[PDB]
Write an enzyme that holds these catalytic residues in place. Structure first.
Site, PDB file in Angstrom:
ATOM      1  N   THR A 126       0.624   3.087 -15.466  1.00 61.57           N
ATOM      2  CA  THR A 126      -0.694   3.695 -15.212  1.00 61.57           C
ATOM      3  C   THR A 126      -1.102   4.626 -16.347  1.00 61.57           C
ATOM      4  OG1 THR A 126      -1.914   5.108 -13.749  1.00 61.57           O
ATOM      5  CG2 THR A 126       0.459   5.482 -13.851  1.00 61.57           C
ATOM      6  N   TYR A 149       2.192  11.890  -8.907  1.00 60.38           N
ATOM      7  CA  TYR A 149       2.089  10.422  -8.990  1.00 60.38           C
ATOM      8  C   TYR A 149       2.509   9.990 -10.394  1.00 60.38           C
ATOM      9  CZ  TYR A 149      -0.201   5.875  -9.744  1.00 60.38           C
ATOM     10  OH  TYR A 149      -0.470   4.565 -10.060  1.00 60.38           O
TER      11      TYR A 149
HETATM   12  N1  NAD Z   1      -5.483   0.256  -8.870  1.00 67.27           N
HETATM   13  C1  NAD Z   1      -5.513   0.899 -10.030  1.00 67.27           C
HETATM   14  O1  NAD Z   1      -6.544   1.360 -10.520  1.00 67.27           O
HETATM   15  C2  NAD Z   1      -4.222   1.059 -10.792  1.00 67.27           C
HETATM   16  C3  NAD Z   1      -4.277   1.660 -12.063  1.00 67.27           C
HETATM   17  C4  NAD Z   1      -3.096   1.945 -12.752  1.00 67.27           C
HETATM   18  C5  NAD Z   1      -1.905   1.469 -12.268  1.00 67.27           C
HETATM   19  N2  NAD Z   1      -1.856   0.764 -11.094  1.00 67.27           N
HETATM   20  C6  NAD Z   1      -0.569   0.231 -10.676  1.00 67.27           C
HETATM   21  O2  NAD Z   1      -0.750  -1.138 -10.335  1.00 67.27           O
HETATM   22  C7  NAD Z   1       0.117  -1.423  -9.234  1.00 67.27           C
HETATM   23  C8  NAD Z   1      -0.671  -1.951  -8.068  1.00 67.27           C
HETATM   24  O3  NAD Z   1      -1.689  -1.014  -7.712  1.00 67.27           O
HETATM   25  P1  NAD Z   1      -2.632  -1.461  -6.531  1.00 67.27           P
HETATM   26  O4  NAD Z   1      -3.869  -0.641  -6.593  1.00 67.27           O
HETATM   27  O5  NAD Z   1      -2.662  -2.956  -6.463  1.00 67.27           O
HETATM   28  O6  NAD Z   1      -1.823  -0.868  -5.270  1.00 67.27           O
HETATM   29  P2  NAD Z   1      -1.673  -1.437  -3.775  1.00 67.27           P
HETATM   30  O7  NAD Z   1      -1.169  -0.354  -2.902  1.00 67.27           O
HETATM   31  O8  NAD Z   1      -2.877  -2.167  -3.296  1.00 67.27           O
HETATM   32  O9  NAD Z   1      -0.555  -2.563  -4.066  1.00 67.27           O
HETATM   33  C9  NAD Z   1       0.854  -2.247  -4.256  1.00 67.27           C
HETATM   34  C10 NAD Z   1       1.689  -2.883  -3.154  1.00 67.27           C
HETATM   35  O10 NAD Z   1       3.064  -2.438  -3.259  1.00 67.27           O
HETATM   36  C11 NAD Z   1       3.644  -2.622  -1.998  1.00 67.27           C
HETATM   37  N3  NAD Z   1       4.908  -1.909  -1.967  1.00 67.27           N
HETATM   38  C12 NAD Z   1       5.047  -0.567  -2.183  1.00 67.27           C
HETATM   39  N4  NAD Z   1       6.269  -0.144  -2.042  1.00 67.27           N
HETATM   40  C13 NAD Z   1       6.979  -1.272  -1.653  1.00 67.27           C
HETATM   41  C14 NAD Z   1       8.340  -1.467  -1.346  1.00 67.27           C
HETATM   42  N5  NAD Z   1       9.241  -0.481  -1.315  1.00 67.27           N
HETATM   43  N6  NAD Z   1       8.721  -2.715  -1.002  1.00 67.27           N
HETATM   44  C15 NAD Z   1       7.808  -3.694  -1.005  1.00 67.27           C
HETATM   45  N7  NAD Z   1       6.507  -3.622  -1.266  1.00 67.27           N
HETATM   46  C16 NAD Z   1       6.149  -2.369  -1.602  1.00 67.27           C
HETATM   47  C17 NAD Z   1       2.600  -2.087  -1.027  1.00 67.27           C
HETATM   48  O11 NAD Z   1       2.795  -2.614   0.274  1.00 67.27           O
HETATM   49  C18 NAD Z   1       1.291  -2.519  -1.713  1.00 67.27           C
HETATM   50  O12 NAD Z   1       0.725  -3.663  -1.108  1.00 67.27           O
HETATM   51  C19 NAD Z   1       0.906  -0.143  -8.931  1.00 67.27           C
HETATM   52  O13 NAD Z   1       2.164  -0.085  -9.600  1.00 67.27           O
HETATM   53  C20 NAD Z   1      -0.019   0.950  -9.440  1.00 67.27           C
HETATM   54  O14 NAD Z   1       0.739   2.127  -9.692  1.00 67.27           O
HETATM   55  C21 NAD Z   1      -2.987   0.613 -10.314  1.00 67.27           C
HETATM   56  O1  UGB Z   2      -3.757   5.504  -8.189  1.00 66.29           O
HETATM   57  C1  UGB Z   2      -4.135   4.623  -8.917  1.00 66.29           C
HETATM   58  O2  UGB Z   2      -3.751   3.485  -8.778  1.00 66.29           O
HETATM   59  C2  UGB Z   2      -5.060   5.001 -10.046  1.00 66.29           C
HETATM   60  O3  UGB Z   2      -5.123   6.427 -10.091  1.00 66.29           O
HETATM   61  C3  UGB Z   2      -6.004   6.863 -11.107  1.00 66.29           C
HETATM   62  O4  UGB Z   2      -7.224   6.232 -10.870  1.00 66.29           O
HETATM   63  P1  UGB Z   2      -8.380   7.252 -10.532  1.00 66.29           P
HETATM   64  O5  UGB Z   2      -9.028   7.595 -11.826  1.00 66.29           O
HETATM   65  O6  UGB Z   2      -7.819   8.288  -9.620  1.00 66.29           O
HETATM   66  O7  UGB Z   2      -9.296   6.292  -9.657  1.00 66.29           O
HETATM   67  P2  UGB Z   2     -10.395   6.522  -8.531  1.00 66.29           P
HETATM   68  O8  UGB Z   2      -9.671   6.742  -7.246  1.00 66.29           O
HETATM   69  O9  UGB Z   2     -11.405   5.443  -8.765  1.00 66.29           O
HETATM   70  O10 UGB Z   2     -11.072   7.945  -8.903  1.00 66.29           O
HETATM   71  C4  UGB Z   2     -11.956   7.921 -10.048  1.00 66.29           C
HETATM   72  C5  UGB Z   2     -12.697   9.232 -10.115  1.00 66.29           C
HETATM   73  O11 UGB Z   2     -13.573   9.368  -8.960  1.00 66.29           O
HETATM   74  C6  UGB Z   2     -13.386  10.631  -8.362  1.00 66.29           C
HETATM   75  N1  UGB Z   2     -13.622  10.432  -6.921  1.00 66.29           N
HETATM   76  C7  UGB Z   2     -12.754   9.700  -6.149  1.00 66.29           C
HETATM   77  C8  UGB Z   2     -12.959   9.446  -4.848  1.00 66.29           C
HETATM   78  C9  UGB Z   2     -14.127   9.957  -4.209  1.00 66.29           C
HETATM   79  O12 UGB Z   2     -14.445   9.775  -3.039  1.00 66.29           O
HETATM   80  N2  UGB Z   2     -14.963  10.662  -5.043  1.00 66.29           N
HETATM   81  C10 UGB Z   2     -14.782  10.948  -6.370  1.00 66.29           C
HETATM   82  O13 UGB Z   2     -15.578  11.627  -6.992  1.00 66.29           O
HETATM   83  C11 UGB Z   2     -11.973  11.079  -8.734  1.00 66.29           C
HETATM   84  O14 UGB Z   2     -11.931  12.491  -8.783  1.00 66.29           O
HETATM   85  C12 UGB Z   2     -11.809  10.485 -10.135  1.00 66.29           C
HETATM   86  O15 UGB Z   2     -12.285  11.395 -11.106  1.00 66.29           O
HETATM   87  C13 UGB Z   2      -5.525   6.462 -12.498  1.00 66.29           C
HETATM   88  O16 UGB Z   2      -6.401   6.959 -13.516  1.00 66.29           O
HETATM   89  C14 UGB Z   2      -5.426   4.957 -12.518  1.00 66.29           C
HETATM   90  O17 UGB Z   2      -4.990   4.555 -13.816  1.00 66.29           O
HETATM   91  C15 UGB Z   2      -4.506   4.503 -11.381  1.00 66.29           C
HETATM   92  O18 UGB Z   2      -3.173   5.022 -11.509  1.00 66.29           O
END
Ligand code: NAD
Ligand code: UGB
Ligand code: NAD
Ligand code: UGB
Lengths: 315, 321
Positions: A126, A149
């Site tokens: 991330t 986190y």
């Molecule tokens: N969504 C974003 O913007 C974002 C940005 C940066 C990094 N990431 C990374 O991408 C990955 C996926 O994010 P996402 O938004 O799809 O999250 P998400 O919660 O939708 O998907 C992750 C999945 O991991 C599963 N999981 C967690 N712990 C587990 C365990 N112990 N055993 C089995 N399954 C398990 C959960 O059930 C969940 O469905 C994560 O590693 C997150 O940190 C997400």
């Molecule tokens: O956990 C994750 O997987 C992600 O966490 C981070 O995502 P974020 O930027 O937090 O995403 P996002 O929830 O879209 O909030 C965006 C902005 O909206 C603001 N924000 C949010 C919610 C709301 O209701 N209102 C608001 O202003 C809030 O304050 C923030 O400034 C990492 O950067 C990402 O790489 C990944 O790890």
């Protein structure tokens, strides 16, 4: 080729499994325990498509409570996406699940892989490892996380480097920057803002709404991610940023949503939440060179695909 | 002023409590749950002396199972040394206690320190956060640990920076390099090699023994550590390496022990263990500027001091053994 995807039922995992099954040569095993901030009822929609495909097997178990030896026996490639995400809810008593699922899970997976001949271990991390930085961040900057986190996720990256250096696990690390689109988790900004605008509730803005992100449309995220497998350059040991087409403030995003919906939204401005940067901005130089990565999806097109998805989800 | 020392009964924490109590103005509270690689028997002797000083209070409890509110009420300064150490024993099913005691303990202590007003939170970290680096390493180098232990300690450091940036907890991080001397833990190289040399048993050498460390004599370690409390420089937010007078290979240490003991030792060369760098070497420029830190104990003197301690420990006639 046979590919393990951890967190296969989640936002990104469910999309990655679908992209991989479009290659008739790939067989995919997904594992997901349906935990984290997305209710399990909203996640069975992510994978109904996948279960029908015969080259897809699904396992609904905790990675910490499953026979990792049998799970990995025939695996060529691991995509590790399982984690507890969410910058804002990693404080006090909420921290333990981040350590268990972001540190202990990663360590247990790498322990199971250390005596197996994988082609690649692709670990998803991330932008939150970086913390507050001026300008476009590249992969050589000293990461100093702003949130608990971000700490746990950086700890997973470090475990990958330990097992790469000591046991030659062929790791690649991808750092995603705020991913959005269809199936976006309900605790993320665009899901919340679109749902509030549709229900005619005030839009929750943390701080002044001038904070910006390198928003990465899911299809762009998945192209870079699949590229990490399919590239012909050796990327073993590399950390690669995967970032988006266009940066935007939350205020900018609210205007674009009002243009899609034709609605005038009530803004509710709340206290800033600790552990968030004011700005994220990926240098994608390295993903350009190594993966041929180029994000193509505009915020207006992505935002509208997510808007449509949210309307369909709640009808 | 009132100082809390976590891991107070351990190798370093027992020496720090002893050094702080020499200052008539300092009252010390030590907490230690008697876990990790040193058996609780050998550990009681580390603090023998300390219970007599009425400015010392010893608490035998788990930081994760203690009223931190009551513990921190009157504290001016926290020295956080409690941890599970050992680079070599941090793999597989041994990993969980490093995560509980290095990551969850640090987070829970920082949470409790949020709404008191410390002068300083002095967090003890390790050279193991750096991994394999060439040359003398300074604190601005990209840390890439080689061991699961290193990862858990680097995670503690990052938690310090999170709680500092968000809640203004006045953290200071000290990275110690391999500390030795009287009371050294039985899992560490000098304790093992001296005990094997004393018993005319083969000396266990991992790899070829040409690996080197920045060995820090405990009194040098402790002067740098008190200096972090006493400097008039503003060191809040800083990472500071604490290293030793002389770097040495394991083969060199064995020669110096053969000279002290007069014995000719049999070498048992073993396969190198994963997670260990070939070299550690601290750049102590920062600690010199910020703490006036200068290590003054030679290996010959420090090794004789540890030699005598190990001999005395295993006679089992001193009260503290
Ligand atoms: N969504 C974003 O913007 C974002 C940005 C940066 C990094 N990431 C990374 O991408 C990955 C996926 O994010 P996402 O938004 O799809 O999250 P998400 O919660 O939708 O998907 C992750 C999945 O991991 C599963 N999981 C967690 N712990 C587990 C365990 N112990 N055993 C089995 N399954 C398990 C959960 O059930 C969940 O469905 C994560 O590693 C997150 O940190 C997400
Ligand atoms: O956990 C994750 O997987 C992600 O966490 C981070 O995502 P974020 O930027 O937090 O995403 P996002 O929830 O879209 O909030 C965006 C902005 O909206 C603001 N924000 C949010 C919610 C709301 O209701 N209102 C608001 O202003 C809030 O304050 C923030 O400034 C990492 O950067 C990402 O790489 C990944 O790890
Ligand atoms: N010894 C070295 O060479 C060296 C070098 C680098 C850094 N360090 C660091 O210095 C510190 C002290 O190491 P040491 O060699 O004195 O180790 P030690 O094991 O002798 O002392 C640590 C003490 O912490 C206590 N402890 C652990 N978890 C606890 C918990 N949850 N609650 C309460 N007490 C708990 C243990 O009982 C132990 O007595 C550690 O943080 C270690 O990582 C040590
Ligand atoms: O947490 C800790 O307390 C410490 O862990 C690390 O200490 P180390 O360097 O491991 O100390 P130490 O056990 O004295 O091994 C020294 C050498 O002897 C070799 N070694 C060891 C034992 C043996 O029997 N034979 C042998 O050759 C072995 O191969 C190794 O090369 C950090 O560097 C330190 O900063 C601190 O965190």
């Amino acid at each position: 080729m046979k590919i393990l995807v951890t967190g296969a039922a989640g936002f990104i995992g469910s999309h990655l499994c679908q992209a991989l099954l479009k290659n008739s040569a790939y067989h995919v095993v997904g594992i997901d325990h349906f935990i984290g901030p997305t209710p399990a009822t909203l996640k069975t929609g992510n994978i109904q498509s996948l279960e029908l495909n015969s080259r897809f097997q699904f396992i609904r178990e905790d990675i910490l409570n499953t026979d990792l030896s049998k799970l990995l026996q025939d695996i060529d490639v691991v995509y590790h996406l399982a984690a507890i995400p969410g910058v804002r809810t990693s404080w006090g008593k909420d921290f333990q699940p981040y350590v268990t699922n972001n540190i202990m899970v990663t360590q247990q997976l790498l322990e199971a892989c250390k005596h197996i001949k994988l082609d690649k271990f692709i670990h998803i991390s991330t932008s939150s490892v970086y913390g507050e930085k001026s300008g476009a961040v590249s992969e050589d900057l000293l990461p100093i996380p702003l949130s608990p986190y971000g700490v746990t996720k950086l700890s997973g990256e470090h475990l990958c480097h330990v097992y790469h250096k000591n046991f030659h696990i062929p790791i690649v690390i991808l750092r995603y920057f705020t991913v959005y689109g269809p199936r976006q988790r309900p605790d993320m900004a665009f899901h919340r803002l679109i749902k509030q605008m549709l229900e005619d509730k005030p839009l929750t803005i943390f701080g002044d709404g001038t904070q910006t992100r390198d928003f990465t449309y899911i299809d762009d995220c998945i192209r870079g991610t699949v590229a990490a497998l399919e590239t012909k350059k050796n990327i073993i040991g590399e950390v690669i940023n995967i970032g988006g087409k266009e940066q935007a403030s939350i205020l900018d995003i609210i205007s674009m949503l009002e243009k899609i919906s034709g609605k005038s939204a009530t803004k509710n401005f709340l206290k800033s939440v600790p552990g968030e940067p004011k700005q994220t901005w990926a240098d994608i130089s390295k993903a350009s060179t190594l993966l041929q990565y180029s994000p193509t999806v505009s915020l207006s097109d992505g935002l509208e695909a997510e808007y449509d998805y949210i309307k369909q989800l709640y009808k």
